[PDB]
Amino acid sequence: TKRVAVIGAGPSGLAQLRAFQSAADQGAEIPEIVCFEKQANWGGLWNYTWRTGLDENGEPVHCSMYRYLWSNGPKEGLEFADYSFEEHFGKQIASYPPRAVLFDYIEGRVHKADVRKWIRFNSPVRWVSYDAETAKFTVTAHNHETDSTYSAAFDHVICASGHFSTPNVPFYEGFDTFNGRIVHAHDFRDAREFEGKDVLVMGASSSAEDIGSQCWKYGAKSITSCYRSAPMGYAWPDNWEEKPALEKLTGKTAHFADGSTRDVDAIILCTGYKHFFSFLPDDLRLKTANRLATADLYKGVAYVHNPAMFYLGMQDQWFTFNMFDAQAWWVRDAILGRITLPKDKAAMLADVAERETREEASDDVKYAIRYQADYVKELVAETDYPSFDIDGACDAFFEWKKHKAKDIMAFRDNSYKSVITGTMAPVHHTPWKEALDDSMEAYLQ
């Protein structure tokens, strides 16, 4: 018989479990699945907590979400393929669900799946080794509930431990003497803290955009964002100037590359994350940049230096839930032997290279979206996963992109066509800038 260890109970690990349970429904025998989760409850990033730094058990807080956060993409872009919205909420909702709403939705199908009984919560994995003679992986985990660490052999390890949790926190001259709050996005929690204040937001990507907005919505005196590469470029509110790279701080004085100046009360470092695995030896440890074509993963899921070990979700993410399903099915199939991996490490490296180069062929954002779209499509064709209208996802993604470039601060006040009934979403009872309440029930009436 076989046993498989899944590290993480975020959307990815959860997707993996759904994958095995699905095959077992159909009538397939499956190996024992053990899923280790560090937190007390499933949901990965979506499992919000006020904590920052180390959690109550002393482990580093995984959560990177803050209050007042709504879906960054239209929900129509992420709608599951085996369980849809209305089926869980009963009704049609607006196009940008708040965190709680989406968490409840993520919760919906996982509960319905009866997978929870596979998850060991409060159980950070401490280490994973591979013995070539047994052909077994040895996972080592600490059970916080009983304060005891133990070890166990598995035939496979599927690492679903995320990569938007270990922050890149760069030092700039003046940071250690700045008389104000300096915080990475991983630790940002409540925008009310910056009400009436002058915020500096470093970065030009998703977090800078959304965290900047949050603080604008909740009353910052002003927003200053700064880029080091391409500006976010959107049409910013009155209190929002975008500026070139920081040189240094002197007091509360930000000096920028164009010689200009601004005094700010607070700095939110929206400078991204690293793929970091504290629990992996060199010959298992994935090392890569954040991007659509992840180094060292054949088919974007199988570890080239040891193909009995897998990784989910390690790509940068235009597509999310639907991708992790596509990935999890594939990894499932490879484990059940419906799919046979190459024994030729050269050829697995070839596959990665090809992905990298194709990814690099164009820098246009619609090309990039389309690209991960072709990826999902690739995967879904190679397993019994329900083929679905991905191009329909893409078309939503394209409308999204036109709404943000249109009016960055109102883009969440739009609706998009559904992909299962082509029916364009209703509007929300309330405008985003007015919708100060965050709660699920406020959203749902």
Ligand X SMILES: Cc1cc2nc3c(=O)[nH]c(=O)nc-3n(C[C@H](O)[C@H](O)[C@H](O)COP(=O)(O)OP(=O)(O)OC[C@H]3O[C@@H](n4cnc5c(N)ncnc54)[C@H](O)[C@@H]3O)c2cc1C
Q: Rule CB under 6 A: which residues touch ligand X?
A: 7-13, 36-39, 44-46, 62, 64-65, 71-73, 78, 124-125, 160-162, 164-165, 279, 312-313, 317, 320, 324
Tell me the per-residue interface mask from 266 to 305 with ligand NAP, x by CB under 6 A, - otherwise: ----xxx-----------------x---------------
| Residue 127 interaction partner, one of a copy of itself, ligand NAP, ligand X, none, beta carbon < 5-8 Å per kind | a copy of itself
Q: Does 51 bind a copy of itself (CB under 8 A)?
A: yes
DSSP assignment of 96-118 equals: S-BHHHHHHHHHHHHHHHT-GGG
The DSSP element (H or E) to which 358 belongs, if any, is helix 345-360
CA neighbor of 4 nearest in space, from 336, 384, 382: 336
Secondary structure class of 167 (helix, strand, coil): strand
| Residue pointed to by tokens 């246009």 | 364
- Taking the complex as a whole, the smallest distance from the CB of residue 58 to a copy of itself amounts, in Å, to 4
Q: Could you tell me the two tokens for 5?
A: 């260890």
Q: Does residue 225 have a known ligand-binding role?
A: no
| Residue 60 interaction partner, one of a copy of itself, ligand NAP, ligand X, none, beta carbon < 5-8 Å per kind | a copy of itself
- Taking the complex as a whole, the smallest distance from the CB of residue 180 to ligand X amounts, in Å, to 22
Q: In terms of CB distance, is 183 or 249 closer to ligand X?
A: 183
Q: In terms of CB distance, is 62 or 243 closer to ligand X?
A: 62
Q: Does residue 262 have a known ligand-binding role?
A: no
- Taking the complex as a whole, the smallest distance from the CB of residue 11 to ligand NAP amounts, in Å, to 10
In total, the chain counts a number of residues equal to 445
- CB-based burial label for 120 (10 Å; 0-12, 13-18, 19+): middle
Binding test (CB under 6 A) with ligand NAP, winner from 47, 72, 372, 415: 72
Contacts of 111 (CB under 8 A, 6+ apart): none
Rounded Cα distance between 373 and 418, Å, is 17
Among 188-196, 199-207, 251-259, 370-378, the segment contacting ligand NAP (CB under 6 A): 199-207
Q: In terms of CB distance, is 121 or 175 closer to ligand X?
A: 121
| Residue pointed to by tokens 């199988």 | 302
Tell me the per-residue interface mask from 165 to 184 with a copy of itself, x by CB under 8 A, - otherwise: -xx-xxx---xx--xxxx-x
Q: Could you tell me the two tokens for 207?
A: 């977090």
- Taking the complex as a whole, the smallest distance from the CB of residue 252 to ligand X amounts, in Å, to 26
Rounded Cα distance between 420 and 324, Å, is 19
The DSSP element (H or E) to which 343 belongs, if any, is none
| Residue 243 interaction partner, one of ligand NAP, a copy of itself, ligand X, none, beta carbon < 5-8 Å per kind | none
CA neighbor of 309 nearest in space, from 351, 348, 346, 347: 348
Q: Does residue 207 have a known ligand-binding role?
A: yes
Q: Does residue 311 have a known ligand-binding role?
A: no
Considering only residues 244 to 303 of the shown chain, the ones binding a copy of itself according to CB under 8 A are 274, 276, 278, 280-282, 285, 287
Q: Does residue 122 have a known ligand-binding role?
A: no
Residue 36 one-letter amino acid: F
Secondary structure class of 113 (helix, strand, coil): helix
Residue 144 one-letter amino acid: H
- CB-based burial label for 200 (10 Å; 0-12, 13-18, 19+): buried
CB 223 within 8 A of CB 240: yes
Binding test (CB under 8 A) with a copy of itself, winner from 3, 88, 116, 126: 126
CB 413 within 8 A of CB 198: no
Secondary structure class of 45 (helix, strand, coil): helix
- Taking the complex as a whole, the smallest distance from the CB of residue 423 to ligand X amounts, in Å, to 21
Rounded Cα distance between 401 and 73, Å, is 9
- Taking the complex as a whole, the smallest distance from the CB of residue 346 to a copy of itself amounts, in Å, to 24
β 125-131/136-143 pair status:
antiparallel
CA neighbor of 271 nearest in space, from 348, 190, 211, 339: 211
Binding test (CB under 6 A) with ligand NAP, winner from 168, 239, 288, 306: 168
Binding site for a copy of itself (CB under 8 A): 49-54, 56, 58-61, 126-127, 140, 142, 147-150, 166-167, 169-171, 175-176, 179-182, 184, 186-187, 190, 192-193, 274, 276, 278, 280-282, 285, 287
The annotated binding site for NADP(+) is made up of: 70, 72, 172, 204-205, 207, 228, 412
Binding site for ligand NAP (CB under 6 A): 72-73, 164, 168, 170, 185, 202-208, 228-229, 270-272, 290, 316-318, 320
The annotated binding site for FAD is made up of: 12, 37, 39, 45-46, 62, 72, 125, 317, 320
